[PDB]
Design goal:
part of a larger assembly, 4 chains, A: mainly beta, 6-stranded antiparallel beta sheet, 5-stranded antiparallel beta sheet, B: mainly alpha, 33% helix, rod-shaped, Minor capsid protein 3 (chain B), Major capsid protein (chain D), viral protein, giant virus
């Protein structure tokens, strides 16, 4: 009777489960850790802050380690509710990481918008928006501060925290480029918003302060950190309206052991628009009413999960002119690769193909080494963009190989590669092991 | 070409290969030299290497 | 008004006997030339249709 | 020169081989030692009605 009726019923099939036991679940052994304290302070930013301006900051070496860096913005919304879409990361047009004036990485606003499309999932992506957008139907004139966390190699795991102790000579600094146009703040479509305020910003750097037994160790021992890099340049596509499904061979120019490739198609005039506009709910401004127009999004709903509005029909990647895998339709890279590799939901228009079992983690799990590969190509086939975007009967009622006529505006192609490198710190001098 | 010049033609006139790594099974094994600032400023900060106990105290 | 040109980068390896190519109309299998109102060159060629 | 037949318009061939129609190797372009191979094309202007 009770649990013991199950417990005593020990048998042949238990000899490999509980016979000669190795662990017990009901007594945890904890590890003792080195003393540290977490403190984040403001850095001083060099240069004039504003739309279209470039600024930089050099990180004071107050701490031992650098972990998370958050770029803080204050903005006043220049439009009404629903006219913005993650404006905080639009403003942060890009960030470049240098250690001692030597490039380590560089991220772009479209990447930030692609990263939470792929790797930041559940509550943290909603909270990410809470930190980057107006999410409560706020009205014009509302002002709030935004928190845009950076995602360089050193902040998502304390294990790769940047070693200032051991970097006596290479001073770490960040360059920021600010966007000239932010939708719903400074511009509404292509039209400037009169009276729009200039943003003000500060950068918080999370310093770790260590004790004396370990701080001594850091300054004396050589270090090698296994770190990540982002590789990027853009290109344009040819998207037909009728009679054909166009092909396009986009040559890849990547180096280093790459864990994954990811890409999107967008309308370069509307930040984050990775799908066609249509006269259906949330798919364009005024959707569902007589005032509906399919040239301008209902911006706060720019992101969708309706792959019917995505331009890509199929994609294949070749390695040295040979197929790396057989051709897949576009929804495979949007739904299945992130299911098998990440475990989240990717919005329509964003695609990922992994070489890694778990690319979300930092423990290497399979990579494609593009520095030992002669050539690699991303071969695309597009959907025929023959569906009148303004007719829900046709937008919601058609075949897989066709999409809306407004998909022809998704001319900007962004192919990203996420790779490994090694950060070497030798007697106070820092730099990277491989320059490819 | 003369009878004699012809053997030398092959050896001298015909262009030699400048890139012979086949981009594989070998490849550009040499072209990956480290990025490191080629001698940084060693003034402010050098004491954490040689005078470290003073910093910790 | 113009004669456009392309520089197509090739992705080949191994000892090659020859390179061959054609300019296809993806919508009409095996069509490698222009169509015209002359015999055999288009549907209905030579007639009002 | 290389085959001895008539090739329909729109299909083009350049051989490296003296007899590409056969199997006995008769000259090859080994692209394993050619790092950048490019096919450059110029088009005719499509101005005829």
């Amino acid at each position: 009777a009770g649990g013991l009726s199950q417990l005593v019923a020990y048998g042949a099939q238990d000899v490999y489960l509980t016979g000669n036991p190795q662990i017990t679940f009901f007594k945890t052994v904890y590890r003792r850790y080195t003393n540290f304290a977490i403190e984040s302070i403001q850095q001083t930013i060099n240069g004039s802050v504003g739309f279209g301006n470039k600024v930089s900051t050099q990180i004071s070496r107050n701490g031992d380690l650098i972990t998370d860096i958050v770029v803080e913005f204050v903005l006043t919304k220049g439009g009404n509710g629903g006219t913005t879409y993650y404006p905080a990361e639009e403003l942060l047009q890009d960030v470049e990481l240098e250690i001692g004036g030597q490039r380590i990485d560089k991220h772009y606003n479209d990447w930030f918008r692609t990263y939470d499309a792929l790797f930041r999932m559940n509550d943290d992506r909603y909270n990410y928006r809470r930190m980057t957008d107006w999410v409560n139907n706020e009205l014009v004139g509302a002002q709030k501060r935004f928190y845009v966390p950076l995602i360089f190699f050193f902040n998502q795991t304390p294990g790769l925290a940047l070693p200032l102790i051991a970097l006596q000579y290479h001073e770490v600094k960040l360059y920021f480029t600010l966007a000239s146009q932010v939708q719903g703040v400074n511009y509404n479509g292509s039209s400037a918003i009169a009276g729009a305020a200039q943003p003000t910003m500060s950068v918080w750097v999370d310093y770790i302060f260590l004790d004396t037994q370990e701080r001594t160790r850091f300054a004396q021992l050589p270090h090698e950190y296994l770190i990540e890099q982002l590789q990027f340049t853009g290109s344009e596509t040819a998207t037909p309206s009728a009679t054909t499904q166009a092909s396009q061979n986009i040559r890849l120019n990547f180096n280093h052991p790459t864990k994954y490739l990811a890409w999107n198609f967008n309308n370069p005039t509307n930040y984050g628009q990775y799908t066609a506009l249509a006269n259906i709910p949330g798919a364009c401004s005024g959707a569902g009413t007589a005032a509906a127009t399919v040239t301008t999004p209902d911006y706060g709903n720019t992101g969708t999960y309706n792959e019917q509005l995505a331009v890509l029909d199929s994609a294949k990647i070749q390695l040295n002119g040979q197929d790396r895998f057989a051709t897949r339709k576009g929804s495979y890279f949007n739904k299945v690769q992130p299911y098998q590799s990440i475990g989240g939901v990717t919005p329509a228009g964003v695609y990922l193909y992994s070489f890694a079992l778990k690319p979300a983690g930092r423990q290497p799990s399979g990579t494609c080494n593009f520095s030992r590969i002669d050539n690699a190509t991303l071969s695309l086939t597009y959907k025929t963009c023959s569906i009148d975007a303004t007719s829900p009967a046709a937008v919601l009622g058609n075949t897989e190989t066709v999409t809306a006529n407004t998909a022809t505006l998704l001319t900007a192609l962004n192919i990203y590669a996420k790779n490994y490198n090694v950060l070497r710190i030798m007697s106070g001098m820092g730099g990277l092991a491989y320059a490819n | 070409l003369s009878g004699e010049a012809a053997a030398m033609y092959g050896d001298v006139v015909v262009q030699k290969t400048t890139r012979a790594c086949r981009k594989s099974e070998g490849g550009f094994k040499d072209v990956n030299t480290e990025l490191w600032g080629t001698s940084p400023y060693l003034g402010r900060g050098d004491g954490e290497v040689y005078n470290m106990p003073a910093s910790n105290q």
